[PDB]
CSV table of C-alpha atoms in Angstrom, one decimal:
chain,number,residue,atom,x,y,z
A,1,UNK,CA,48.7,-197.4,8.0
A,2,UNK,CA,47.5,-197.4,11.7
A,3,UNK,CA,47.6,-193.6,12.4
A,4,UNK,CA,48.1,-193.4,16.2
A,5,UNK,CA,46.0,-191.3,18.8
A,6,UNK,CA,46.4,-190.7,22.4
A,7,UNK,CA,43.0,-189.3,24.1
A,8,UNK,CA,44.5,-188.6,27.5
A,9,UNK,CA,47.1,-186.2,25.9
A,10,UNK,CA,48.0,-184.6,29.1
A,11,UNK,CA,47.4,-185.9,32.6
A,12,UNK,CA,48.6,-184.2,35.9
A,13,UNK,CA,48.3,-187.0,38.6
A,14,UNK,CA,49.1,-186.9,42.6
A,15,UNK,CA,52.1,-188.8,43.7
A,16,UNK,CA,50.5,-192.4,43.8
A,17,UNK,CA,46.9,-192.5,42.5
A,18,UNK,CA,46.9,-195.5,39.8
A,19,UNK,CA,46.8,-193.4,37.0
A,20,UNK,CA,45.2,-194.6,33.6
A,21,UNK,CA,46.6,-193.9,30.2
A,22,UNK,CA,45.1,-195.2,26.8
A,23,UNK,CA,45.2,-195.0,23.0
A,24,UNK,CA,43.1,-196.4,20.2
A,25,UNK,CA,44.3,-198.3,17.3
A,26,UNK,CA,42.6,-197.0,14.0
A,27,UNK,CA,42.9,-200.4,12.4
A,28,UNK,CA,42.4,-203.8,14.0
A,29,UNK,CA,45.4,-205.5,15.7
A,30,UNK,CA,44.6,-208.4,17.9
A,31,UNK,CA,47.2,-207.6,20.9
A,32,UNK,CA,50.1,-206.2,18.6
A,33,UNK,CA,51.3,-203.4,20.9
A,34,UNK,CA,54.2,-202.1,23.1
A,35,UNK,CA,54.3,-199.3,25.3
A,36,UNK,CA,57.3,-197.0,25.4
A,37,UNK,CA,58.8,-194.4,27.9
A,38,UNK,CA,60.7,-191.5,26.8
A,39,UNK,CA,62.2,-189.4,29.8
A,40,UNK,CA,63.6,-186.0,29.5
A,41,UNK,CA,66.4,-185.8,27.5
A,42,UNK,CA,67.1,-189.7,27.6
A,43,UNK,CA,66.6,-192.9,25.7
A,44,UNK,CA,62.9,-194.3,25.2
A,45,UNK,CA,62.7,-197.7,27.1
A,46,UNK,CA,60.3,-200.1,26.0
A,47,UNK,CA,57.8,-200.8,29.1
A,48,UNK,CA,55.3,-203.5,27.7
A,49,UNK,CA,55.7,-205.7,24.8
A,50,UNK,CA,52.7,-207.8,23.1
A,51,UNK,CA,50.3,-205.5,25.3
A,52,UNK,CA,50.4,-208.1,28.2
A,53,UNK,CA,54.0,-208.9,29.0
A,54,UNK,CA,56.8,-207.0,31.2
A,55,UNK,CA,60.0,-206.9,29.2
A,56,UNK,CA,62.9,-206.9,31.7
A,57,UNK,CA,62.9,-205.2,34.8
A,58,UNK,CA,59.6,-203.5,34.3
A,59,UNK,CA,57.8,-203.7,37.6
A,60,UNK,CA,54.5,-205.0,38.6
A,61,UNK,CA,53.2,-201.2,38.7
A,62,UNK,CA,52.5,-201.6,35.1
A,63,UNK,CA,49.6,-203.5,34.3
A,64,UNK,CA,49.0,-202.3,30.7
A,65,UNK,CA,46.3,-204.6,28.6
A,66,UNK,CA,43.7,-204.1,25.9
A,67,UNK,CA,43.0,-205.1,22.5
A,68,UNK,CA,41.6,-204.3,19.0
A,69,UNK,CA,40.6,-200.8,19.3
A,70,UNK,CA,41.2,-199.9,22.9
A,71,UNK,CA,44.6,-200.1,24.7
A,72,UNK,CA,45.2,-199.1,28.5
A,73,UNK,CA,48.2,-198.7,30.7
A,74,UNK,CA,47.9,-198.6,34.3
A,75,UNK,CA,50.6,-197.0,36.5
A,76,UNK,CA,50.3,-197.7,40.2
A,77,UNK,CA,52.3,-195.8,42.8
A,78,UNK,CA,53.9,-193.1,40.5
A,79,UNK,CA,57.2,-192.2,41.6
A,80,UNK,CA,58.6,-188.8,40.3
A,81,UNK,CA,60.7,-190.5,37.6
A,82,UNK,CA,57.7,-191.6,35.9
A,83,UNK,CA,56.9,-188.1,34.7
A,84,UNK,CA,57.6,-188.8,31.1
A,85,UNK,CA,56.5,-189.4,27.8
A,86,UNK,CA,54.4,-192.7,26.9
A,87,UNK,CA,54.1,-194.1,23.7
A,88,UNK,CA,52.2,-197.0,22.1
A,89,UNK,CA,53.4,-198.7,18.9
A,90,UNK,CA,51.7,-201.4,17.0
A,91,UNK,CA,53.6,-204.4,15.4
A,92,UNK,CA,51.4,-205.4,12.4
A,93,UNK,CA,51.4,-202.7,9.7
A,94,UNK,CA,54.5,-201.6,8.0
A,95,UNK,CA,55.3,-198.7,8.1
A,96,UNK,CA,55.5,-198.5,12.0
A,97,UNK,CA,53.9,-195.6,13.4
A,98,UNK,CA,54.4,-194.5,17.2
A,99,UNK,CA,52.2,-193.0,19.6
A,100,UNK,CA,51.6,-189.3,19.7
A,101,UNK,CA,53.0,-189.4,23.6
A,102,UNK,CA,51.2,-189.0,26.9
A,103,UNK,CA,52.8,-186.4,29.1
A,104,UNK,CA,52.7,-187.5,32.5
A,105,UNK,CA,53.8,-185.4,35.4
A,106,UNK,CA,53.4,-185.5,39.4
A,107,UNK,CA,52.1,-182.3,40.8
A,108,UNK,CA,54.4,-180.8,43.6
A,109,UNK,CA,54.2,-178.0,46.1
B,348,UNK,CA,58.8,-223.0,6.6
B,349,UNK,CA,62.3,-223.6,8.1
B,350,UNK,CA,61.7,-227.5,8.1
B,351,UNK,CA,60.2,-227.3,4.5
B,352,UNK,CA,59.2,-230.7,3.5
B,353,UNK,CA,60.6,-231.9,0.3
B,354,UNK,CA,59.2,-234.8,-1.7
B,355,UNK,CA,61.1,-236.6,-4.7
B,356,UNK,CA,58.4,-237.6,-7.4
B,357,UNK,CA,60.0,-239.9,-9.9
B,358,UNK,CA,59.0,-243.0,-12.2
B,359,UNK,CA,55.3,-242.1,-12.5
B,360,UNK,CA,52.6,-240.1,-14.6
B,361,UNK,CA,51.9,-236.8,-13.3
B,362,UNK,CA,48.7,-234.7,-13.7
B,363,UNK,CA,48.8,-231.0,-13.5
B,364,UNK,CA,45.4,-229.6,-15.2
B,365,UNK,CA,43.6,-231.0,-12.1
B,366,UNK,CA,45.6,-228.8,-10.1
B,367,UNK,CA,45.1,-225.9,-12.3
B,368,UNK,CA,41.4,-226.2,-12.9
B,369,UNK,CA,40.5,-227.0,-9.0
B,370,UNK,CA,40.2,-223.1,-8.3
B,371,UNK,CA,41.0,-223.9,-4.6
B,372,UNK,CA,44.1,-222.1,-4.7
B,373,UNK,CA,44.8,-218.4,-4.2
B,374,UNK,CA,47.9,-217.7,-6.2
B,375,UNK,CA,48.8,-219.9,-9.3
B,376,UNK,CA,51.2,-218.1,-11.6
B,377,UNK,CA,53.9,-220.1,-13.3
B,378,UNK,CA,57.4,-219.1,-14.4
B,379,UNK,CA,59.4,-220.8,-17.2
B,380,UNK,CA,56.5,-222.7,-18.8
B,381,UNK,CA,52.7,-222.0,-18.8
B,382,UNK,CA,50.4,-224.2,-16.7
B,383,UNK,CA,48.6,-225.3,-19.7
B,384,UNK,CA,52.0,-226.5,-21.6
B,385,UNK,CA,53.7,-228.0,-18.8
B,386,UNK,CA,51.5,-231.1,-19.3
B,387,UNK,CA,53.0,-231.7,-22.8
B,388,UNK,CA,56.3,-231.1,-21.4
B,389,UNK,CA,58.1,-233.5,-19.0
B,390,UNK,CA,61.0,-233.9,-17.0
B,391,UNK,CA,63.2,-236.3,-15.1
B,392,UNK,CA,62.5,-235.6,-11.3
B,393,UNK,CA,59.8,-233.4,-9.8
B,394,UNK,CA,60.6,-231.9,-6.5
B,395,UNK,CA,57.5,-231.0,-4.2
B,396,UNK,CA,58.4,-228.3,-1.3
B,397,UNK,CA,55.5,-228.0,1.0
B,398,UNK,CA,55.3,-225.5,3.9
B,399,UNK,CA,52.9,-223.2,5.8
B,400,UNK,CA,53.6,-219.4,5.9
B,401,UNK,CA,51.7,-216.1,6.6
B,402,UNK,CA,50.1,-215.0,3.5
B,403,UNK,CA,51.5,-211.4,3.7
B,404,UNK,CA,54.9,-212.8,2.5
B,405,UNK,CA,53.7,-214.9,-0.6
B,406,UNK,CA,55.3,-212.5,-2.8
B,407,UNK,CA,58.4,-213.7,-1.1
B,408,UNK,CA,57.8,-217.2,-2.8
B,409,UNK,CA,59.2,-216.0,-6.1
B,410,UNK,CA,62.5,-216.0,-7.9
B,411,UNK,CA,64.9,-213.1,-6.8
B,412,UNK,CA,63.0,-211.8,-3.8
B,413,UNK,CA,64.1,-210.2,-0.4
B,414,UNK,CA,62.7,-210.7,2.9
B,415,UNK,CA,62.9,-212.9,6.1
B,416,UNK,CA,61.4,-216.0,4.4
B,417,UNK,CA,63.0,-216.0,1.0
B,418,UNK,CA,66.8,-215.2,2.3
B,419,UNK,CA,66.6,-217.6,5.8
B,420,UNK,CA,63.8,-220.2,5.2
B,421,UNK,CA,63.4,-220.8,1.6
B,422,UNK,CA,65.4,-219.6,-1.4
B,423,UNK,CA,64.6,-219.8,-5.0
B,424,UNK,CA,66.8,-219.8,-7.7
B,425,UNK,CA,66.6,-217.1,-10.5
B,426,UNK,CA,66.8,-220.0,-13.3
B,427,UNK,CA,63.8,-221.4,-11.8
B,428,UNK,CA,62.0,-224.1,-13.4
B,429,UNK,CA,58.5,-224.9,-11.6
B,430,UNK,CA,56.3,-222.8,-9.9
B,431,UNK,CA,54.2,-221.9,-6.9
B,432,UNK,CA,50.9,-222.9,-5.4
B,433,UNK,CA,49.3,-221.0,-2.8
B,434,UNK,CA,45.9,-221.4,-0.8
B,435,UNK,CA,44.4,-220.2,2.3
B,436,UNK,CA,44.3,-223.0,5.2
B,437,UNK,CA,42.7,-220.9,8.3
B,438,UNK,CA,40.0,-223.5,9.1
B,439,UNK,CA,42.8,-226.2,9.7
B,440,UNK,CA,46.1,-224.2,10.5
B,441,UNK,CA,44.8,-221.3,12.6
B,442,UNK,CA,43.8,-222.3,16.3
B,443,UNK,CA,41.7,-219.8,18.6
B,444,UNK,CA,44.3,-218.2,21.0
B,445,UNK,CA,47.3,-218.8,18.6
B,446,UNK,CA,48.5,-221.9,16.7
B,447,UNK,CA,52.4,-221.7,17.4
B,448,UNK,CA,53.8,-224.8,15.9
B,449,UNK,CA,55.1,-223.4,12.8
B,450,UNK,CA,58.5,-221.5,13.1
B,451,UNK,CA,60.6,-219.4,10.9
B,452,UNK,CA,64.2,-218.3,10.9
B,453,UNK,CA,64.2,-214.6,12.1
B,454,UNK,CA,68.1,-214.7,12.5
B,455,UNK,CA,70.8,-216.3,10.5
B,456,UNK,CA,74.7,-215.9,9.6
B,457,UNK,CA,74.0,-215.3,5.8
B,458,UNK,CA,71.6,-215.5,3.3
B,459,UNK,CA,70.5,-219.1,2.1
B,460,UNK,CA,71.7,-220.6,-1.2
B,461,UNK,CA,68.8,-221.8,-3.4
B,462,UNK,CA,67.4,-224.9,-2.0
B,463,UNK,CA,69.0,-224.9,1.3
B,464,UNK,CA,67.9,-226.8,4.4
B,465,UNK,CA,68.3,-225.4,8.0
B,466,UNK,CA,67.2,-227.0,11.1
B,467,UNK,CA,69.8,-226.3,13.6
B,468,UNK,CA,68.4,-224.3,16.6
B,469,UNK,CA,71.7,-223.0,18.0
B,470,UNK,CA,71.5,-219.9,20.1
B,471,UNK,CA,72.3,-216.8,17.8
B,472,UNK,CA,75.1,-214.3,18.4
B,473,UNK,CA,73.6,-210.5,18.1
B,474,UNK,CA,76.3,-209.3,20.0
B,475,UNK,CA,80.0,-210.4,21.4
B,476,UNK,CA,80.1,-213.0,24.5
B,477,UNK,CA,80.1,-216.9,24.7
B,478,UNK,CA,76.5,-217.3,24.9
B,479,UNK,CA,77.3,-221.0,25.8
B,480,UNK,CA,73.8,-222.5,24.8
B,481,UNK,CA,71.6,-220.4,27.0
B,482,UNK,CA,69.2,-217.6,26.4
B,483,UNK,CA,70.1,-214.1,27.4
B,484,UNK,CA,70.8,-210.4,26.1
B,485,UNK,CA,72.1,-210.4,22.4
B,486,UNK,CA,71.7,-214.2,22.8
B,487,UNK,CA,68.4,-215.0,21.1
B,488,UNK,CA,66.7,-218.1,19.9
B,489,UNK,CA,66.9,-217.7,16.2
B,490,UNK,CA,63.4,-219.2,15.4
B,491,UNK,CA,60.3,-216.7,15.8
B,492,UNK,CA,57.0,-218.3,16.1
B,493,UNK,CA,53.8,-217.9,13.7
B,494,UNK,CA,50.9,-216.5,15.5
B,495,UNK,CA,47.7,-217.8,13.9
B,496,UNK,CA,44.1,-216.7,14.8
B,497,UNK,CA,40.8,-217.5,13.2
B,498,UNK,CA,39.8,-213.8,13.7
B,499,UNK,CA,42.8,-211.8,12.1
B,500,UNK,CA,43.3,-210.4,8.7
B,501,UNK,CA,43.3,-212.4,5.5
B,502,UNK,CA,46.7,-211.9,4.6
B,503,UNK,CA,47.9,-212.5,8.1
B,504,UNK,CA,46.6,-215.7,8.1
B,505,UNK,CA,48.1,-219.1,7.6
B,506,UNK,CA,48.5,-220.1,4.0
B,507,UNK,CA,49.5,-223.5,2.7
B,508,UNK,CA,52.2,-223.2,-0.2
B,509,UNK,CA,53.6,-226.2,-2.4
B,510,UNK,CA,56.2,-225.2,-4.9
B,511,UNK,CA,56.9,-227.7,-7.6
B,512,UNK,CA,60.5,-227.6,-9.2
B,513,UNK,CA,61.5,-229.4,-12.4
B,514,UNK,CA,64.8,-230.4,-13.9
B,520,UNK,CA,63.3,-238.6,-18.2
B,521,UNK,CA,60.5,-240.7,-16.7
B,522,UNK,CA,57.8,-238.2,-15.2
B,523,UNK,CA,55.7,-237.7,-18.1
B,524,UNK,CA,52.0,-236.9,-18.0
B,525,UNK,CA,48.6,-238.2,-19.5
B,526,UNK,CA,47.8,-239.1,-22.8
B,527,UNK,CA,44.2,-240.0,-24.5
B,528,UNK,CA,42.6,-238.3,-27.6
B,529,UNK,CA,39.7,-240.4,-28.9
B,530,UNK,CA,38.3,-243.9,-29.5
B,531,UNK,CA,40.0,-246.4,-32.1
B,532,UNK,CA,38.6,-245.9,-35.5
B,533,UNK,CA,38.1,-248.7,-37.7
B,534,UNK,CA,37.6,-249.1,-41.5
B,535,UNK,CA,38.3,-245.5,-42.1
B,536,UNK,CA,41.5,-243.7,-43.5
B,537,UNK,CA,43.0,-242.4,-40.6
B,538,UNK,CA,46.8,-240.9,-39.9
B,539,UNK,CA,47.2,-242.8,-36.5
B,540,UNK,CA,49.8,-242.1,-34.0
B,541,UNK,CA,50.6,-245.1,-31.7
B,542,UNK,CA,53.3,-244.4,-29.1
B,543,UNK,CA,55.1,-242.2,-31.6
B,544,UNK,CA,54.9,-244.3,-34.7
B,545,UNK,CA,53.3,-242.3,-37.3
B,546,UNK,CA,51.4,-244.2,-40.2
B,547,UNK,CA,48.1,-243.9,-42.1
B,548,UNK,CA,45.9,-246.5,-43.0
B,549,UNK,CA,42.8,-248.5,-42.1
B,550,UNK,CA,42.5,-250.5,-38.8
B,551,UNK,CA,40.9,-253.8,-38.9
B,552,UNK,CA,40.0,-256.8,-36.6
B,553,UNK,CA,42.8,-259.3,-36.9
B,554,UNK,CA,43.2,-263.0,-36.4
B,555,UNK,CA,47.1,-262.6,-36.0
B,556,UNK,CA,47.9,-264.3,-32.3
B,557,UNK,CA,50.1,-261.8,-30.8
B,558,UNK,CA,52.3,-263.5,-28.1
B,559,UNK,CA,51.7,-261.4,-24.9
B,560,UNK,CA,54.7,-259.5,-24.7
B,561,UNK,CA,55.5,-257.9,-28.0
B,562,UNK,CA,53.6,-255.0,-29.3
B,563,UNK,CA,53.2,-254.5,-33.0
B,564,UNK,CA,53.3,-256.6,-35.9
B,565,UNK,CA,55.6,-256.5,-38.9
B,566,UNK,CA,56.1,-258.3,-42.3
B,567,UNK,CA,58.7,-259.1,-44.9
B,568,UNK,CA,60.3,-256.2,-46.2
B,569,UNK,CA,59.6,-254.5,-42.8
B,570,UNK,CA,56.4,-252.6,-42.8
B,571,UNK,CA,54.4,-252.2,-39.6
B,572,UNK,CA,51.2,-253.9,-40.7
B,573,UNK,CA,49.8,-255.2,-37.4
B,574,UNK,CA,49.6,-253.5,-34.1
B,575,UNK,CA,48.1,-253.9,-30.8
B,576,UNK,CA,47.0,-251.0,-29.3
B,577,UNK,CA,48.8,-250.0,-26.0
B,578,UNK,CA,45.5,-248.7,-24.8
B,579,UNK,CA,43.1,-251.8,-24.3
B,580,UNK,CA,45.1,-254.5,-25.8
B,581,UNK,CA,43.3,-256.0,-28.6
B,582,UNK,CA,44.9,-256.7,-32.5
B,583,UNK,CA,44.4,-254.4,-35.4
B,584,UNK,CA,45.5,-255.0,-38.8
B,585,UNK,CA,46.8,-251.9,-40.7
B,586,UNK,CA,46.3,-251.8,-44.1
B,587,UNK,CA,47.6,-249.0,-46.6
B,588,UNK,CA,44.9,-246.4,-47.7
B,589,UNK,CA,43.6,-247.3,-50.9
B,590,UNK,CA,46.0,-245.7,-53.2
B,591,UNK,CA,45.4,-247.0,-57.1
B,592,UNK,CA,46.0,-245.1,-60.0
B,593,UNK,CA,43.3,-243.9,-62.4
B,594,UNK,CA,42.8,-244.4,-66.1
C,1,UNK,CA,78.8,-201.7,26.5
C,2,UNK,CA,75.9,-200.6,24.3
C,3,UNK,CA,76.4,-197.3,22.6
C,4,UNK,CA,74.9,-195.7,19.4
C,5,UNK,CA,76.5,-192.4,19.0
C,6,UNK,CA,75.5,-190.2,16.0
C,7,UNK,CA,76.7,-187.5,14.0
C,8,UNK,CA,76.1,-185.4,10.6
C,9,UNK,CA,73.5,-183.1,11.7
C,10,UNK,CA,73.5,-179.4,10.8
C,11,UNK,CA,71.9,-176.5,9.1
C,12,UNK,CA,71.2,-177.0,5.4
C,13,UNK,CA,69.2,-175.2,2.6
C,14,UNK,CA,65.9,-176.7,1.6
C,15,UNK,CA,67.0,-178.6,-1.6
C,16,UNK,CA,70.4,-179.3,-0.3
C,17,UNK,CA,72.3,-182.4,0.6
C,18,UNK,CA,74.0,-183.8,3.6
C,19,UNK,CA,75.1,-187.1,5.3
C,20,UNK,CA,74.5,-188.7,8.7
C,21,UNK,CA,76.7,-191.5,10.6
C,22,UNK,CA,75.8,-193.6,13.7
C,23,UNK,CA,78.8,-195.3,15.2
C,24,UNK,CA,77.7,-198.5,16.8
C,25,UNK,CA,79.3,-200.2,20.0
C,26,UNK,CA,80.1,-203.9,20.6
C,27,UNK,CA,77.8,-205.2,17.7
C,28,UNK,CA,77.8,-205.4,14.0
C,29,UNK,CA,75.9,-202.9,11.8
C,30,UNK,CA,76.3,-204.9,8.8
C,31,UNK,CA,75.0,-208.2,10.3
C,32,UNK,CA,72.3,-206.9,12.7
C,33,UNK,CA,68.8,-205.4,12.1
C,34,UNK,CA,68.6,-201.7,12.6
C,35,UNK,CA,66.6,-198.5,11.4
C,36,UNK,CA,66.5,-195.0,11.1
C,37,UNK,CA,63.9,-192.9,12.8
C,38,UNK,CA,62.9,-189.4,13.4
C,39,UNK,CA,61.3,-187.4,15.8
C,40,UNK,CA,59.8,-183.7,15.2
C,41,UNK,CA,57.8,-181.7,17.6
C,42,UNK,CA,54.0,-181.5,16.8
C,43,UNK,CA,54.2,-184.8,14.9
C,44,UNK,CA,54.9,-188.2,16.4
C,45,UNK,CA,57.8,-190.4,16.6
C,46,UNK,CA,58.5,-191.6,12.8
C,47,UNK,CA,60.0,-194.5,11.2
C,48,UNK,CA,62.1,-193.6,8.0
C,49,UNK,CA,64.2,-196.6,7.3
C,50,UNK,CA,65.2,-200.0,8.3
C,51,UNK,CA,68.2,-202.0,7.0
C,52,UNK,CA,69.1,-205.8,7.3
C,53,UNK,CA,71.9,-208.3,7.4
C,54,UNK,CA,73.0,-207.6,4.0
C,55,UNK,CA,69.4,-207.6,3.0
C,56,UNK,CA,67.4,-204.5,1.7
C,57,UNK,CA,66.7,-201.1,2.4
C,58,UNK,CA,63.3,-200.5,3.3
C,59,UNK,CA,61.9,-196.6,3.4
C,60,UNK,CA,59.1,-194.9,4.2
C,61,UNK,CA,56.7,-193.9,1.4
C,62,UNK,CA,57.1,-190.2,2.2
C,63,UNK,CA,60.7,-190.3,1.8
C,64,UNK,CA,61.2,-193.0,-0.7
C,65,UNK,CA,63.3,-191.9,-3.6
C,66,UNK,CA,65.0,-189.0,-1.6
C,67,UNK,CA,66.8,-190.4,1.4
C,68,UNK,CA,69.5,-193.0,0.7
C,69,UNK,CA,71.3,-195.5,3.0
C,70,UNK,CA,74.9,-196.8,2.3
C,71,UNK,CA,76.2,-198.8,5.4
C,72,UNK,CA,80.1,-198.4,5.0
C,73,UNK,CA,81.9,-201.6,6.2
C,74,UNK,CA,85.2,-200.5,7.7
C,75,UNK,CA,83.9,-200.2,11.3
C,76,UNK,CA,80.7,-200.2,13.1
C,77,UNK,CA,79.0,-197.2,11.3
C,78,UNK,CA,75.8,-196.6,9.6
C,79,UNK,CA,75.2,-193.7,7.2
C,80,UNK,CA,72.2,-192.0,5.5
C,81,UNK,CA,72.7,-189.5,2.8
C,82,UNK,CA,70.1,-187.1,2.6
C,83,UNK,CA,69.2,-185.3,-0.7
C,84,UNK,CA,66.2,-183.2,-1.6
C,85,UNK,CA,65.3,-182.2,1.8
C,86,UNK,CA,61.8,-180.6,2.0
C,87,UNK,CA,60.7,-178.0,4.4
C,88,UNK,CA,58.9,-180.6,6.9
C,89,UNK,CA,62.3,-182.4,7.5
C,90,UNK,CA,63.4,-180.7,10.6
C,91,UNK,CA,63.9,-183.6,12.9
C,92,UNK,CA,66.2,-185.4,15.3
C,93,UNK,CA,67.2,-188.6,13.6
C,94,UNK,CA,68.1,-191.9,15.8
C,95,UNK,CA,69.6,-195.0,14.7
C,96,UNK,CA,67.9,-197.6,16.8
C,97,UNK,CA,68.6,-201.6,16.7
C,98,UNK,CA,65.7,-203.6,16.1
C,99,UNK,CA,64.7,-207.3,16.8
C,100,UNK,CA,64.3,-208.0,12.9
C,101,UNK,CA,61.3,-205.7,11.9
C,102,UNK,CA,59.2,-206.1,15.1
C,103,UNK,CA,60.2,-203.7,17.7
C,104,UNK,CA,62.9,-201.1,18.5
C,105,UNK,CA,65.4,-202.8,21.0
C,106,UNK,CA,67.9,-199.9,21.5
C,107,UNK,CA,68.0,-196.3,20.6
C,108,UNK,CA,70.7,-193.7,20.1
C,109,UNK,CA,71.2,-190.2,21.2
C,110,UNK,CA,70.2,-188.6,18.0
C,111,UNK,CA,71.6,-185.8,15.9
C,112,UNK,CA,69.2,-183.0,15.0
C,113,UNK,CA,68.9,-181.4,11.5
C,114,UNK,CA,67.1,-178.3,11.1
C,115,UNK,CA,66.2,-177.1,7.5
C,116,UNK,CA,65.0,-173.4,7.1
C,117,UNK,CA,65.8,-170.2,4.9
C,118,UNK,CA,67.8,-168.6,7.7
C,119,UNK,CA,71.4,-168.8,9.1
């Protein structure tokens, strides 16, 4: 199976800096990736499906792309409601394995 | 695969060992009858169901299987006569960036009956609202498209699969030897079994009728069903000894 | 109204049995594609099982043979009976509606099961 790994496992970023998150896929998938966002005690929404399309109401802030063995999500202007858990999940291999979660928070005073 | 092409094959002679020995086919295993001995058996009508799938679900082309393709695109009966031919088609059916002409029924109302055809692209009802022909939330298109690349994995590649289904005219080839003259042979011409020596004859057979006969009916002459010449049949030298 | 409300969690002995439920809203359990997923801390989010329209029950290789799923068609409910629970099975379980076997469209709130030698 594809065992997921997030390299930036914890990233503290200023309120609007165009932050960069990533994962690597341990096997070879063409563009079979979806990005997920789980908020604090909330339902984990999809962000990106097919690694290049924004599904429904997903803004132009999210410019996630990547292929093969390196995948990257770009968050642009960083409202404080984006301080959440970012997953990446493949489409190709049964059983489906989610990402380990990227903990993104915004530093305050 | 959802618009799976079915060809009726009737009133001809079918050759199956050429398909068995070609070695261009990845999966060739047969249910109901061995591939060697389905050439000496024969049927009434032969159905050829051709499609292109992804190669990872070729186990789903089998009697009594579960999955998207077996239950919503092409269903096999349990009492299945005939079998499955599977071979790779990555150099023709897969294009760079995605060949998306091939589609499969991702959603349906129920499972299929064996040998059922579905072409209807009516909008699916995942939830409860009048979808009214348009696409929207819980109102999806029931067909999902195959994504074919030339750089992907081997089972995740397009595979051409042709399934032959059996059920009486469609009977196969027949040849053993040459014709054998002036020696005792226990011949078999079209099914008539007789023993004797075959000789050149002067009996001017009329062009329609096949084999000769005499008074106190014995099949003393024959034309061959093979090359159309005339052969006397003489009984095989049976005298007593003193 | 999209709701997937879950129940059946609680503390059980390692080697005991329990039963889950996922009441669905506005769509049909027995005719749509959904899945049972788990989340435990330290580990990632993990797929456990998926269930089709009528279809077949597909399990993870770790829990194959142990969990079972038997959807009950009296209402929009989805169950999972848990037998022979190991020590690593402390997780919150979520019922998640799928787009076939591609991607998790919707999720529940999850019911969390803790298994331990305590009270």
